[PDB]
UniProtKB/Swiss-Prot annotation, chains A, B:
Cellular location(s): Cytoplasm; Nucleus
Residues of the whole record sequence present: 5 to 203 of 861
Keyword annotations: Acetylation, Cytoplasm, Isopeptide bond, Nucleus, Phosphoprotein, Repeat, Ribonucleoprotein, Ubl conjugation
Subunit structure: The vault ribonucleoprotein particle is a huge (400 A x 670 A) cage structure of 12.9 MDa. It consists of a dimer of half-vaults, with each half-vault comprising 39 identical major vault protein (MVP) chains, PARP4 and one or more vault RNAs (vRNAs). Interacts with TEP1. Interacts with PTEN and activated MAPK1. The phosphorylated protein interacts with the SH2 domains of PTPN11 and SRC. Interacts with APEX1. May interact with ZNF540.
Name of encoding gene: Mvp
Protein name: Major vault protein
GO term, biological process aspect, one: negative regulation of epidermal growth factor receptor signaling pathway
GO molecular function: identical protein binding; protein kinase binding; protein phosphatase binding
Ranges for the MVP repeats: 1-52, 53-107, 108-160, 161-199
UniProt entry tagged with the keyword Nucleus: yes
This protein's GO CC annotations: cytoplasm; cytoskeleton; nucleus; perinuclear region of cytoplasm; ribonucleoprotein complex
Length: 199, 199
């Protein structure tokens, strides 16, 4: 049929065979396709993201500094392809032709008071407060609080802060030329103790 | 049929196929649908909430500062989608197209004299008396009284206040750099005693 039914919060993709490019078809409207148009799939709900949750879709529609969906000169949506987008929490928004949904309403990261998150850049990027991170720079995020899942950063594991009781010490060991608690060149394979009672 | 029967306290949702948006149909009236209109479901009772009870419906209709149901320019009700509403106790009100009933006439929280409620923000929000709460800030609500279920706050568990009799003390233990009864840096894993006879 040439008659489509898009309810208040659903979307579809239409491939206009004459214009040979596609576009997003957001409601609310019981829209009717032209002879050239052809709907690919049925109304599917718009990508929702509740508060304190997140989602991340690859091939994001590259928007200018005003945040508008630049439709390419051909008529197809302008996608970054390789890049991703960090969708925090927002209204049900419709995906455009070409966006592969990778994360979807996944609960946001919840770091406990006595643990942390091992970080690993995936590529080089400028940090929140203006720092150059290298491909493998090991960042560490102790909380408590909630981390915001990034595309230039990856969480490797969860660190459990070892509790050193009174009259105790924690035997450590370095895996690189790093610096520990009190300024001692800590070479690879070297060991040392912790010296303050506290997680 | 094109004839509908809404009793004094019931409602329905109607999807006008020409206007391609929906709206709420609150009584009291035996309303008749147009050729364009089509009723989705039968009269269902309006969302009631008795005194000293509560309910909470997600996707709440975002009202302005005057508390009116802003109908969107399309004609559909304007919903916050991700957010929720804190319905305390009020008359039987009708739901709008798009609101998923999550809490419904659940009895309000009743904190006893000798217990409390472990709190856990779910996200950041401004507190009753102007305080910034972080995603995981641990609040504690001793009563007696009745707490009001929030959307930015979550009750984790019920604390039973341990009664320390005469010539006794309670062995405590910290799980973070917190402060106990008398100002001593209480590091993680440290232990100490209570020193006043009283719940």
């Amino acid at each position: 049929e040439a008659i489509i039914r898009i309810p208040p919060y659903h979307y579809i993709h239409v491939l206009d065979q004459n214009s040979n490019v596609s576009r997003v078809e957001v409601g609310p409207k019981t829209y009717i396709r032209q002879d050239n148009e052809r709907v690919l799939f049925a109304p599917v709900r718009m990508v929702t993201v509740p508060p304190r949750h997140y989602c991340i879709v690859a091939n994001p529609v590259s928007r200018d500094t005003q945040s508008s969906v630049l439709f390419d000169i051909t008529g197809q949506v302008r996608l970054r392809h390789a890049d991703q987008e960090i969708r925090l929490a927002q209204d049900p928004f419709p995906l455009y032709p070409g966006e592969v949904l990778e994360k979807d309403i996944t609960p946001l990261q919840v770091v406990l008071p006595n643990t942390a998150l091992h970080l690993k850049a995936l590529l080089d990027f400028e940090d929140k407060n203006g720092d150059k991170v290298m491909a493998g720079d090991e960042w560490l995020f102790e909380g408590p609080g909630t981390y915001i899942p990034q595309k230039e950063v990856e969480v490797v594991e969860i660190i459990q802060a070892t509790v050193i009781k009174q009259n105790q010490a924690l035997r450590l060991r370095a895996r690189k030329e790093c610096f520990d608690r009190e300024g001692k060149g800590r070479v690879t394979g070297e060991e040392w103790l912790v010296r303050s009672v506290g997680a």
